[model samples]
Target: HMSTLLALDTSTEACSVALLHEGRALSHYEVIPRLHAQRLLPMVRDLLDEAGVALSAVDAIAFGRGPGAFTGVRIAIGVVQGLAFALQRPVLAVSDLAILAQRAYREQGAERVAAAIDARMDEVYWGCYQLQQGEMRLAGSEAVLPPERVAVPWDAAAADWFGAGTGWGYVERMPQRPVALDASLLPHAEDLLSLAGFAWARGEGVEAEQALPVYLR
Candidate 1:
């Protein structure tokens, strides 16, 4: 089915939006600081405008649920909650680390990835994921703690793992080194679209009231 969907994220320095309709997807993404609150809605509006559709044009809404900046995650969830609630649309709350892992796969062909977001205060929000049957599947629960305390799944030892996101900036803090690393990677709505689209097709969508943020604090 060519179900239409809208996905958004403001979970970090980045603010992005993706609109998928009839099997085609388009997005507007950026990494500008402190401006997330001011620019997020505009990006959503412009993406919809370029897609030649109104807010009612989508079947559901999906967004990054945090392990990120408290303020940034709150902004995205608050906006998505209002939009989904008012439009009577199903909601999908996706993990930020999972988004990064998915992006690592898309950008670097990584089969297994360790995604970490700098949680500040000498800590990182970390999660491990593997490409299971061609999808990013979490290998362990996401956690927020000092980078040196992050852990991976037992099976990851022999796998070719990639390190992604700003947390890799402190590579020495990682529990293990990835085969290759990309610390510049940030979560984007495009990746969220892939994950959310799959979820929507599988009937995994939830209600607006059920949308919640996981800060991992």
Candidate 2:
């Protein structure tokens, strides 16, 4: 069955929403800092209208579930839970790190990604991912740590990695050097949708109330 999934991410300076309908996808993204709460719902409404799809038609709701800005993550979780509960749809809680990793894969064709988000307090939220079956899968535990402490997975130490997200701003302090990097990167819902597709296929969806945030700190 072709599943319709609605994906959202507000765990950074960027705010985005994506819908997968009938095997095609539609999305809207913006880097509007601090305005996510005001624009997120309207963006969702506009996307559904543009696709001529009803909110209830979405089979599942997916969202960046944290390790980002405190307020941003909270906003995402709040909105997702409300929508999922109202639609009686299961929820897919994807990691913001994983979302960034997926974005690197989609936009840059980077099969191996070391995704990070600036977590303030002189630290970063980091995780490594590798392409697997067209999806970026985590290769190591995600954590919040100083740049000097970050490292690629032990098994792939010599492998090239694409560094993505604001956390790479501290590249001079980070020991590992990525073959390519994008310090301005933010998690986009379109990539989140792609990851969610794999997760959904794995039967990882959960009840609305089961959706939770991950704060590495």
Candidate 3:
């Protein structure tokens, strides 16, 4: 069955909500330095209302399981677990970095993207992805480490790579350069919906009890 998916990400300063209904999506987005807890619920209500769909109408909830700020990740994770439990909906836990890669593809038409989020305490959470059959797939390992140790899966074949998230601000510290960098690109709910929709089709969701945040520490 085609799934109706609700996806959200408050994994960074940016927060967004999205609903995927029969291949179309309705989204709410904000880039706030604080207060994701306050913004998230209201945006969820608004997006659901705008979509003309109820919580029960959705087949599952997809969330950005993080390598992000602690408070933001916890807030997003808690809400997803709460909703999934209440509605008996399975949870699709999409990686926050994967969302960034997907956003690069969606917004920048990037065929190869490397995502790095500021993991704080002088570290970065990094990952690389490449488009395969129109979907972003992990191209290298993901880790929380200093930018200098970022083991990018670079090659002569895919010479062009786009970089996303705040960690790219430290580009001088990196051994490689991005063809283009969009440090403003955080994980978004709309891209989570796309990735989760694919996962749901593969029956990849877990029980609510099994759903939890991935700090990637």
Per-candidate TM-scores read 0.93, 0.94, 0.94
What is the lDDT of every predicted structure here? 0.85, 0.89, 0.85
Candidate 1 minimal-lDDT segment of 10 residues: 208-217
Which residue runs of candidate 1 sit more than 4 Å off their true CA positions? 154-159, 211-216
Against the hidden true structure, what lDDT does model 1 obtain?
0.85
Q: Is candidate 1 or candidate 3 better by TM-score?
A: 3
The digit string of per-residue lDDT tens for model 3 on 1-217 reads: 5579999998888899999887788888899978898899899998989888888898999999888888888888789889999999888889988899999899989888889888778888899998987778997678888888776787634558888888887778987777679877778898988888778987888778873545444
The local lDDT score (0 to 100) that residue 102 gets in candidate 1 is 89
Name the candidate that leads on TM-score.
Answer: 2
lDDT of 1 at 28: 87
Q: In candidate 2, how many Å is residue 68 off?
A: 1.3
Residue pairs in collision within model 3: none
Ranked by TM-score, the better of candidates 1 and 2 is 2
Clashes of 1: 0
